[PDB]
Amino acid sequence: VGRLIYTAGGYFRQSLSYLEAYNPSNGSWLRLADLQVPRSGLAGCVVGGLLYAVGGRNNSPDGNTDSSALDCYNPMTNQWSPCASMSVPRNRIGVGVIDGHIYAVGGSHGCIHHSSVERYEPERDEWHLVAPMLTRRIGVGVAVLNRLLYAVGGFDGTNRLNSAECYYPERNEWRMITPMNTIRSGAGVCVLHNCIYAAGGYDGQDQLNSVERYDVETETWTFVAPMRHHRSALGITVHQGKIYVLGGYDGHTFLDSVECYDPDSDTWSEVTRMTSGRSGVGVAVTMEPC
């Protein structure tokens, strides 16, 4: 089917503009068109086969600029095109897609910690604010399951969170769900099968390698096999029934390792390494560029 794991931006010494794509079929990496502005703490997502880079921050030697930008990469043309900007800058944002619409969740702007949420309409090229979360969350994990939007963990400006909430679009309303077993900010959050996975993160004391998953039916969080590396501010995505985690920060170095979770065997294995270690990347999956 020819889909790649795209990684956009990230941080190592400074915010980066790399766009690189990994092919699990042959293990190859491709460096593609750079982002127009270097961004870390951004989020990636895909709508209509187009890759989107949302929010983040340019942590440069001379500046610390939070981003409200929404930029669209087209694999057919290998070019970035700007889109309408969000209502507010959002560093360490969370992003989910429901029915072709992009939801931007939380994130930080200076010392402000957002509870606000806004929804992007690609063909109309418009952002609109929706109901804010019950909790302010930066470094929040966000995923979509059964057309419901989940915001998991993060940092409210005072405490790191094990809490999580769910957004029900037809009622424009947020509801708390079962809290995680572990306090997690900067975790990788994705959906695999009928479960929301929360991998890694920071509990206030150490970077985590534990992973727990939420069964939306039973409303319980259960630990699965831990990752090989402790990591927070990691990239995460799902590809053909497996979780891929990319990079992050383990408290010592910026990782380049890419681990892969197989739910059938409940095991993690390293499948490749990124061209360089980095944290705070935006990751998504779409067609290969040609």
Partner: peptide
Amino acid sequence: LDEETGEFLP
């Protein structure tokens, strides 16, 4: 250092 991301703040 931002212990969650590894980023230098100043």
